[PDB]
């Protein structure tokens, strides 16, 4: 059964997926844009863009593969810039200060 449809629209070629125990879903982008989705609701709550390198091509900013660790508080992304980035969930952040992106659906994009 189709459980839910995420707000994945506007991402283009998602290279990799990773799922946390905490339902943080990861979607590595070929555009370099990496987006974090709540798995239960299918909502983007963070969108981020990496830096490519000191000197490298603008197409190389892309995530190719990813995993969480056993704990789930680290995200390891191997990217096409010939590097590994370790993404870390930011502590000292309460609901206030950073709710993320607003829970705003539209019926025009008929995803639901």
């Amino acid at each position: 059964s189709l459980l839910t449809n995420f707000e994945s629209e506007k991402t283009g070629i998602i290279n990799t997926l990773s799922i946390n125990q905490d339902d943080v879903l990861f979607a590595g982008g070929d555009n370099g844009v990496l987006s974090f989705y709540d798995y239960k609701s299918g909502h983007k709550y963070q969108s981020l863009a990496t830096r490519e390198m000191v000197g490298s091509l603008e197409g190389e900013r892309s995530v190719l593969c990813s995993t969480f660790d056993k704990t789930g508080l680290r995200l390891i992304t191997g990217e096409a810039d010939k590097s590994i980035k370790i993404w870390k969930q930011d502590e000292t952040a309460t609901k206030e200060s950073e709710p993320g992106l607003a829970w705003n659906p539209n019926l025009s994009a008929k995803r639901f």
Partner: protein, 70 residues
């Protein structure tokens, strides 16, 4: 013509319905049969007194082509 790129790869669907041969290969011999489980002279003269993601612009590549050309 006669020199073409692939439109598709050779699929495993066709090889699954063939009959086998049972020829005996050297690398399919029994080996590792047991799994392991986890538990003043200086005055007269004219004048005295870091990583880039490019294999061709790298410092090692410059030190290469200076030594291997000469």
């Amino acid at each position: 013509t006669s020199h073409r790129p692939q439109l598709e790869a050779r699929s495993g669907a066709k090889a699954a319905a063939y009959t086998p041969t049972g020829i005996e290969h050297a690398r399919l011999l029994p080996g590792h049969t047991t799994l392991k489980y986890r538990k003043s002279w200086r005055k007269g003269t004219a004048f005295g007194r870091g990583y880039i993601n490019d294999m061709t612009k790298s410092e090692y590549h410059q030190e290469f082509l200076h030594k291997h050309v000469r």
